[PDB]
Symmetry: C3
Subunit: 108 residues, 3 copies
Amino acid sequence: SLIETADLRLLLTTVSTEVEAQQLAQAAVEAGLAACVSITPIQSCYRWQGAIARETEQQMSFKTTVEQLDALQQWLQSQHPYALPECLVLTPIASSVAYRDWLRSSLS
Amino acid sequence: SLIETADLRLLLTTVSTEVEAQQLAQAAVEAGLAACVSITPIQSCYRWQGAIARETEQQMSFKTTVEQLDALQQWLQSQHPYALPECLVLTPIASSVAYRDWLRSSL
Amino acid sequence: SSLIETADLRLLLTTVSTEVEAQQLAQAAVEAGLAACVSITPIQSCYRWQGAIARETEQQMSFKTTVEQLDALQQWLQSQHPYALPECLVLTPIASSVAYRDWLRSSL
């Protein structure tokens, strides 16, 4: 049942706290900006303003379409305006018809 | 030993429980359909059945080749606990010579 | 904050066995200028080893870098990774924000 896909997108970002991740995920789905969101606890080590830090974060992966992606990304920024958040987008190359159709059905 | 690659695939899906994930991963490797499978605990938020839900799940990532991918997905569908499984496929664009060779040879 | 097309960012994925190993390798890669950020996630990995199915705890690592540093990062992993034959899978994000891409590039 695999089909080629070019219009699905995964938006990856991080936030510091579980509570923020949960709230952002719920509201993005309610807004029709993403169909599904996963939240994974991580540790991140990074260069920021000269120094190296290791902090706990929540990795978020938002499932959306190319049509909703800009709106989603801008909306997420609006939710933590003080942050320069991680923003990486991946394009899946295939999916199932049913999963693709469900995902597209979930967006507004 | 970095090489450009086009024939490797990652198939992403989720299941509800650790037990389900462990069993499905083992069976896929046993069948020669995936070289290796990672399992990561997540929380997932989505609307289903008219209502927004947040539930704990296990993210699975199956490493395979383009040649085995259809067989893996057909198998996974027959064996997956969900009526509508997540199915997303990524293509890595580079690997190491040794890792690519391991993955392909293991199938 | 707007999304822009990106072709020169890379995510290198590998695993190690322990949290300590992952923290040390991540710190060392950032210190050497080979990655801007490294995330670490505990996982289980299932694979066949010596003819038998194994399932082991591991740490999934994701190194955020540029195409220009990718070869040097992989070469450095040849010497520094704890495993003789590490996982090595590289993804290319297709978009990012201007701010994030600029942060990542300026960190290296």
